Amino acid sequence: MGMDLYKTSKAAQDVWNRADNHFKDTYGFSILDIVINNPVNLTIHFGGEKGKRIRENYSAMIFETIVDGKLKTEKIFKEI
Amino acid sequence: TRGTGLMSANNIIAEGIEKMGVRTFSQKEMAFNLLGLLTPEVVELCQKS
Amino acid sequence: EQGIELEHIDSKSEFAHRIMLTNILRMMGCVKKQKSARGIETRPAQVI
């Protein structure tokens, strides 16, 4: 989807890049290797410093939830 | 270590060295070490330096 | 290689040096090339 175009319009690659490059640097996955080949499973490595940065990016998020009026600070990833 | 084909020729003085206040490992003992060198504690210690 | 002193150094050693050193290098310089491509930079390889 669109990757036919991502080869064509500078204006669109300037987008897909700026996005993936940011993910890779923040969550560790480029979609430009997702869309082209829909895999069944994606495993994330938390390697060195970047890996830690990113695993906390993954654990730094919270499933707040309206119970009791509680902005329920609830973990998004729990296996993390 | 002892039993390996690098020092087994020398296997017959191990008992002699330990007297100097030293240990000589079985390969299964030296096995415990580098396996304990994969520990998720170290693994960072190298993923840093 | 045992019993080999200096003047007895020839192929069988020049062969080993290459087993351990000049091939472990080329070994390790042959996984990165397989990582750098796929962009793996958080699951590196601990070496022993």
Swiss-Prot record, chain A:
Coiled coil segments of this chain = none
UniProt record similarity statement? Belongs to the fungal fatty acid synthetase subunit beta family.
Q: Could you give the subunit structure recorded for this chain?
A: [Alpha(6)beta(6)] hexamers of two multifunctional subunits (alpha and beta).
Instruction: Share any extra remarks.
Output: Present with 91800 molecules/cell in log phase SD medium.
Q: What is this protein called?
A: Fatty acid synthase subunit beta
| Taxonomic superkingdom | Eukaryota
Q: What does this protein do?
A: Fatty acid synthetase catalyzes the formation of long-chain fatty acids from acetyl-CoA, malonyl-CoA and NADPH. The beta subunit contains domains for: [acyl-carrier-protein] acetyltransferase and malonyltransferase, S-acyl fatty acid synthase thioesterase, enoyl-[acyl-carrier-protein] reductase, and 3-hydroxypalmitoyl-[acyl-carrier-protein] dehydratase.
